[PDB]
């Protein structure tokens, strides 16, 4: 996998490739690694497909129950529920998860949860096998308070490179935009992003 989430002026954008691997065989070339746990709290999944799905399903369930009793949960709260699962079951889980959401108070927020179940709040986050190849690039090109179009370009260019070098990344680039205006799904195909 290659995944990332980036905060900007109006909120946050999540991005991911669409490759699921089963050896060196591509088991699924159009996977959706961007996953809803609440209306405007989403996550990017990396690591074990089974582990991350099982985790996201439980988190979605907790937040649905949270909503019923106490109203809309904060992005921080959602990240806390992911952590609790990942940390307490660290021996049996291979899950690298980025949590991203939009409050109206807090605007865009990104929390990354690596293998051990630690939590890290960041302006942007990258993860997955393909992320190693774009630490250089992303650190050099990220700024705070980018526009929507700048942020789409940053993610598109970054994941383009991760996909280029990482054999475990590929297919389409998916993105999910999270603002006050609602929720927008974007998709970019190889013929566009490859030759960037």
């Amino acid at each position: 996998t290659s995944i990332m989430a980036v905060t900007f002026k109006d909120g946050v954008i999540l991005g991911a490739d669409s490759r699921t691997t089963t050896g060196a065989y591509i088991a699924n070339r159009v996977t959706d690694k961007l996953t809803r746990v609440h209306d405007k709290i989403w996550c990017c999944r990396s690591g074990s497909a089974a582990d991350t799905q099982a985790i996201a399903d439980i988190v979605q369930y907790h937040l649905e129950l949270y909503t019923s009793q106490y109203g809309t949960p904060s992005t921080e709260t959602a990240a806390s529920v992911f952590k609790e699962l990942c940390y307490e079951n660290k021996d049996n889980l291979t899950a690298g998860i980025i949590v991203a959401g939009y409050d109206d108070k807090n605007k865009g927020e990104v929390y990354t949860i690596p293998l051990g179940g630690s939590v890290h709040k960041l302006p942007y986050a990258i993860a997955g096998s393909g992320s190693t190849f774009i630490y250089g690039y992303c650190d050099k090109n990220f700024r705070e308070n980018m526009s929507k179009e700048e942020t789409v370009d940053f993610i598109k260019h970054s994941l383009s490179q991760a996909i280029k070098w990482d054999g475990s990344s590929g297919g389409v680039i998916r993105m999910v935009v999270l603002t006050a205006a609602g929720v927008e799904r974007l998709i970019f195909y190889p013929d566009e992003y490859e030759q960037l």
Binding site: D57, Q60, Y61, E64, S68, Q69
Partner: protein, 241 residues
Amino acid sequence: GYDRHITIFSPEGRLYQVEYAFKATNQTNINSLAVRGKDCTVVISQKKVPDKLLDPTTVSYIFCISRTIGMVVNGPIPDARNAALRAKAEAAEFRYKYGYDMPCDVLAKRMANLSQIYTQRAYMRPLGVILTFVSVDEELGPSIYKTDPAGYYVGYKATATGPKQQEITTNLENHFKKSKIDHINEESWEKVVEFAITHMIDALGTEFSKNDLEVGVATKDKFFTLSAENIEERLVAIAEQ
């Protein structure tokens, strides 16, 4: 007569604790009513704030169980909230286990089964509540299903509950007799709410200000309650009529 304290049969084959639980249903002295539109299900209930010291916004007998299900209770508030918390948990679990939103009628059945158990197992008392569940089901359309302390439940064209229930019931029966249909033949939920308030006024023979009522609307893909202002807007339109 210890067959009167726990839920075992009396010599005439009755459950007094269940019957007395029904009497606790009216302890609050509120009347509720529910009707179905074309696109929606409306439930209205009287809101009575006696004490001036209460925060009126925290006084409610309508509950949002899930995104799509609402529930109004007739009965004391502790039992009402007990039932609401359980319903919320059951509806969330159902979604997780089976991958789709719990239907109004299935939730009603499930809560009814839970109530049935209290009528059979001795250590649990029945809850002194009647639960009216409402939604716009994705398969069945606008839905009203109601539960009582006996563990009985059924679907309704429309319904009412409370001390002056029979007045409201016959008022509604007389309308459907005349209208010849299953529901309120109205496009917007705003007008179905207006119908509901109007026929509650006639049957009870009383007027309402914005703070005397409490309204819940179920549409396709959300159930919500109205503010004092959305109700005022609604009372105004009934007056100009």
